[PDB]
């Protein structure tokens, strides 16, 4: 999965 | 501004309708109009502004990555020459993306940040400034790349300094700021060790403070803590 | 036209890149530019044109339905008055949608349909004319509603007449035309029995002709036949 | 499900 940002 | 004739409250109401209709470009235009009324934004209004632009720029960034990958393949050995079209279209999307980032950064500079005195607003806007400089850094290739990267770093670092002094370690803004600054370190600043250290320390300090929270706040904080853990799992 | 300076082949190449990047507004603008070069469209090019506009108008229609539902609820007994904003924003989306339909209908009238002599092109364009008049009918409420509905009906009926004479019953254009004209009967023309009869007859006549097809053509035809069956299941 | 068109 693609790394998370918010 | 095309929204200059519309009431502030009507712009906010329409931004919420646009969100429900998944019309994020409209939502962003309504929120830009609301910001340009010159009054400070409430917490709910700040989150409408961020949701709108995050969705707009998110679509542009995803498209840019698709086109960049095609352009990269075109420049490999053995690839047939197909002309300037891939570069031109990647550039068109890139210019539009940069325009949206410049718009957001302009709203922050005129005059959201300078009027934001409470920690929750100031940290939120400085996180946004770091995020939109980071999106500029994702596409930058020229003489200003280092300065764009340093502008993102500086905004994030100010937000971190305020958040550490003024917010609990479980605050969702603080957590999301740390998540994004960690990603900045990993994939923009070529500092994966810093990225991992920040994510781990942020997670552990939030864990230790969960006992102070209501059930609803606990849910809010643990959601972002899971994103920190997801990134740590990806990176280790 | 802003695409007047770009080569026809470059517009087509960029339309394909825009599709890969899910940039359907760009894809539609590129295909409009290609149509305006004045040459007939190949089969692949016709499908790029239709994919682009179907995605653009599909987003607008979905947003219009969300806003229409909110507006309907606002007008129920016991609902608090919230001002003109819901109507205004529904109208804004509606006007944009009507503009896109008018753009497509304009391309068909100037001059795609008049130059289309082969059954596959002529039926394809007449189906599109019926579809975009049908999208206008979905939002029409005034004096012209009956004429908009009749324009959709007339375009579909000409396409049906040609397709029955010139195409096999398994042709995917013929099948999709019938699927959409059946939906027109069901939900625009208040003729559910006609909708069901058309879907059933279309399915049965295609079934009987599958034995003539290659494996790849069989897959193409059965995909649309399953949509006819899905609608029949929903409606019976 | 919503009825199908293509
Ligand atoms: Mg006022
Ligand atoms: Mg070769
Ligand atoms: Mg550039
Ligand atoms: Mg190490
Ligand atoms: Mg030429
Ligand atoms: Mg009441
Ligand atoms: Mg209207
Ligand atoms: Mg009956």
Residue numbers in the entry:
A (entry chain B), D (entry chain B): 590 to 595
B (entry chain A), C (entry chain A): -4 to 231
Reproduce passages from the article.
Since the responsible kinase is not known, native T594 phosphorylation is inaccessible. We thus introduced double-point mutations (F591R/P592R) within the ERα construct, enabling PKA phosphorylation at T594. The two-point mutations make the ERα C-terminal end closely match with the consensus sequence of known PKA substrates (RRXS/TY), thereby increasing the chances of successful phosphorylation of T594 by PKA. Fluorescence anisotropy binding studies of 14-3-3ζ to peptide mimics of the wild-type (WT) ERα and PKA-responsive ERα sequence confirmed that the PKA-responsive point mutations did not hamper binding of ERα to 14-3-3ζ.
The hub protein 14-3-3 is an endogenous regulator of various NRs, providing a novel entry point for small molecule modulation of NR activity. An alternative approach to modulate NR activity is via their protein–protein interaction (PPI) with the hub protein 14-3-3. These 14-3-3 proteins are known to interact, and thereby regulate, hundreds of different, mainly phosphorylated, protein partners. In the case of ERα, 14-3-3 binds the phosphorylated penultimate residue T594 in the C-terminal F-domain, thereby reducing E2-dependent transcriptional activity. Exemplified, 14-3-3 binding to the C-terminal F-domain of the estrogen receptor alpha (ERα), and small molecule stabilization of the ERα/14-3-3ζ protein complex by the natural product Fusicoccin A (FC-A), was demonstrated to downregulate ERα-mediated breast cancer proliferation.
